[PDB]
Design a protein around this ligand. Structure first.
Ligand SMILES: Nc1ncnc2c1ncn2[C@@H]1O[C@H](COS(=O)(=O)NC(=O)[C@@H](N)CO)[C@@H](O)[C@H]1O
Ligand SMILES: Nc1ncnc2c1ncn2[C@@H]1O[C@H](COS(=O)(=O)NC(=O)[C@@H](N)CO)[C@@H](O)[C@H]1O
Ligand SMILES: Nc1ncnc2c1ncn2[C@@H]1O[C@H](COS(=O)(=O)NC(=O)[C@@H](N)CO)[C@@H](O)[C@H]1O
Ligand SMILES: Nc1ncnc2c1ncn2[C@@H]1O[C@H](COS(=O)(=O)NC(=O)[C@@H](N)CO)[C@@H](O)[C@H]1O
Ligand SMILES: [Mg+2]
Ligand SMILES: [Mg+2]
Ligand SMILES: [Mg+2]
Ligand SMILES: [Mg+2]
Lengths: 441, 441
């Protein structure tokens, strides 16, 4: 969340900036005034508590002297004490409601972000096409072949996954990966780790379960509602993670980078499976492994000094671009409109790759600067309270990245294996043949 | 479960064999007599239902004729019908209780299994040591160095995992893998897949969630009690899998290998994460990644003709032995006593590898022939009811396999990388240095 003092003009903050941000977000502007009011009530209670302590100390110090009368001093002590009890209770309630309200306020939207609720207004930041690919159309970028099949059709013809047995065993969107489906997924995981490791990222495999209290410090309420699976463990509960961002953001909770010039930035190549209920996503992207309930993801997670996060943000999206360029996948980078930012993000870029069968750009990567919104909550201090900035960016959500590869590397008789992945696959195949026909053809 | 007819002498079965097996298992022998009694009650009801149908048909066929009187035929129809209703209800209840009882009976213990409740009596099947390793002692097998550190100490000195941040974020046994911890885990996963794929196994990545009704057909009750995590999905529930054995065993549920000579055996190299509450395991193996709540495992899963399963069982444990030999890890293979077999297993071998710091053999692999116990429940038919046999065997539970490597590949200044894994790790290191000191030293 934002610092309390950010709401307080008298403390150096600017509530106006916060209201403007709320407006850009399409979120409550009223929250800001309410937060300010409750803060003043809290301060009043704190002063009153202070005064009662002063009176109490004065009174019991008098009782000591008249200990030589003194049922009146006692009568007042009991009075002041009873009042103090009440004040103590109100203060704690006020602090609670104040923090609850502040928790609802999204991070300050960066001035460079387009103010809109309509993704049609996403900023077109950059476009990239591979060599020998004239323009985005219904043509597999890597092979030049007609993009005749969708990703799920390609994967079926390759005998690379099993949605039918998947659905019977797990329910909707359930799947097994098979044969080269497994090998390609592993290839992306290992290439991704190797790729980031070469750039100084530390490989970090995160647990996929988190304690509720920790999850609550890094995920917003809406995620608990329609995103996260709850785990029952005897009499206890945990959550399954939606992204390694969650546990890795808490990795340095309560720690202090007290010599940041030498200690930061810290860069993690996160790897985990990810689990999402997709509770608001019915029917959309029904077949294939494009949108599923469980998937693997190589994540960039970085902590930097507050003064260096914006440069790091550029470095991180640049890292993902280089990764997709290395796979020969056409893409565009877009600046997400204010109305589509989650609470933690001050700025977000998505990399959307070209799917030639769909003939559409589809999101493969989100890259966010969350400044100190999460680190304040997790108490991750920086230097000299000053907190580190946290940024996160997809490197590769592997099953969805496979979908993009499938459409762009297809040809008449099968699938060309992207050159950079070959060394990660037994036999280092350059090409794998279609094994099955589609029922429809 | 076993076939109903197995309990019925008149149907060609031998209840005596089943009672002897129950006794070997240390399980209820009474169950068998009860199952036989309830079957007879069920048969009685079936005959009575049959007779009522005959009478009813006779009666309503008379009512048709007197339709030319006839309130007596009607009075009897209503009588017979009311009786039939009751019989129908009793029959269904009997069938239910009969199957419930049969479900409690473990598979027939193979005659070659030692009859005992005490693992001290496990059969010592085979022992193996690598080259230049005289005998199992407190010496790292691969390097000849003193086995000075436990697996968790080695992993800590390598900065290869983080149990402290793991515990804070997930709770007891929680961990992150870091740096070469991640690379070694991936190395084992990919080597294992490549290894089995070269032997004709089909790589199959299983989903880690299963519908309750399907899980119930392959897991025994005790697993639901202290092993499986339940998942909350809105108003629905699923289970997390304890092993890819579970979903892969259900992969061919309701299918029919009608030309088994050509269609079987079918061999899967299963890969998944695995989740276990270890609810009955408090404090034991407290530190390290030897016994954890989440781990990866490459699994052998095979379906064969009933007449070929015993030969396949030998092939499968042989495959695992070859795998550990290739890693240079000393081990023994033991025939598990009858009293330690789960319900599905007719026979089980464990491969237990030498941990030189612990100076003990520790289980890394279980290999089981479950004959047709699971396939009967999942309706996986074979030829010409005749069901396939199912077998399963660990190839590598990767985190625990890492523990064995750590103790056996340690030397004074760090860890030698097993030769076969080198190609799976960026830089193909032959050795990685200790990075941190232990607090205690
Ligand atoms: N037809 C293909 N077969 C295999 N890999 C391909 C194919 N097309 C593109 N790629 C992969 O995608 C990457 C980007 O390809 S590219 O944009 O066309 N450029 C190049 O190929 C060269 N600039 C470098 O190889 C390549 O390095 C290659 O690994
Ligand atoms: N339900 C899903 N199925 C398959 N892939 C998904 C699913 N949801 C998200 N992804 C993939 O994972 C990527 C990152 O997810 S995200 O929600 O957008 N952002 C994050 O999780 C951040 N931690 C950055 O990775 C998406 O861009 C998409 O490529
Ligand atoms: N000191 C070591 N360094 C790296 N790898 C080792 C070491 N010791 C054993 N291994 C691995 O474990 C395997 C089995 O080793 S062995 O039993 O001693 N036998 C041999 O090394 C030879 N028979 C084949 O290399 C070897 O193939 C090797 O890959
Ligand atoms: N809690 C755990 N933590 C780490 N590894 C475990 C844990 N439980 C089991 N394993 C590893 O997984 C292996 C197989 O597990 S098993 O329960 O014995 N058997 C199975 O699951 C069978 N499907 C065969 O693999 C064990 O031999 C052990 O090496
Ligand atoms: Mg928002
Ligand atoms: Mg996104
Ligand atoms: Mg038993
Ligand atoms: Mg076992």
């Amino acid at each position: 969340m934002l610092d309390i003092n950010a709401f307080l003009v008298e403390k150096g903050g600017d509530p106006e900036i916060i209201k403007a941000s709320q407006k850009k977000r399409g979120d409550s502007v009223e929250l800001v005034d309410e937060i300010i009011a409750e803060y003043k009530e809290w301060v009043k209670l704190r002063f009153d508590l202070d005064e009662h302590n002063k009176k109490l100390n004065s009174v019991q110090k008098e009782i000591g002297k008249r200990f030589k009368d003194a049922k009146d001093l006692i009568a007042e002590k009991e009075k002041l004490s009873n009042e103090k009890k009440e004040i103590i209770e109100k203060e704690a309630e006020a602090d609670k409601n104040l923090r609850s309200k502040i928790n609802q306020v999204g991070n300050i939207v960066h001035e460079s972000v387009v103010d809109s609720q309509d993704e049609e207004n996403n900023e077109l930041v950059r476009t990239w096409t591979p060599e020998n690919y004239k323009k985005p159309e219904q043509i597999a970028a890597a092979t030049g072949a007609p993009a005749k099949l969708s990703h799920h059709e390609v994967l079926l013809r390759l005998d690379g996954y099993d949605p039918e047995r998947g659905v019977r065993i797990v329910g909707h969107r359930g799947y097994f990966l098979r044969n080269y489906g497994v090998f390609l997924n592993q290839a992306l995981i290992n290439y991704g780790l190797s790729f980031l490791s070469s750039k100084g990222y530390v490989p970090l495999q995160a647990p996929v379960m988190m304690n509720k209290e920790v999850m609550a410090k890094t995920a917003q309420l809406s995620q608990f509602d329609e995103e996260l699976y709850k785990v029952i463990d005897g009499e206890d509960e945990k959550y399954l993670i939606a992204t390694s961002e969650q546990p890795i953001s808490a990795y340095h909770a309560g720690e202090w980078f007290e010599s940041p010039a030498e200690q930061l930035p810290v860069r993690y190549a996160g790897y985990s499976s990810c689990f999402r209920r997709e509770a608001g996503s019915h029917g959309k992207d029904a077949w294939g492994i494009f949108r599923v309930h469980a998937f693997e993801k190589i994540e960039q997670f970085v902590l930097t000094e507050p003064e260096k996060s914006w440069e790091e943000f550029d470095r991180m999206i640049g890292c993902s671009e280089e990764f997709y360029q290395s796979l020969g996948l056409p893409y565009r980078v877009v600046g997400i409109v204010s109305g589509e930012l989650n609470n933690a993000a001050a700025k977000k870029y998505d990399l959307e790759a070209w799917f030639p069968f769909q003939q559409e750009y589809k999101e493969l990567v989100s890259c966010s600067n969350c400044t100190d919104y999460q680190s304040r909550n997790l108490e991750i201090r920086c230097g000299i309270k000053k907190y580190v900035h946290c940024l996160n960016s997809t490197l590769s959500a592997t099953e969805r990245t496979i979908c993009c590869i499938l459409e762009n590397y297809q040809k008449e008789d099968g699938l060309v294996i992207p050159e950079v992945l070959r060394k990660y696959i037994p036999g280092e195949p350059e090409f794998i043949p279609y094994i099955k026909e589609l029922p429809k053809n």
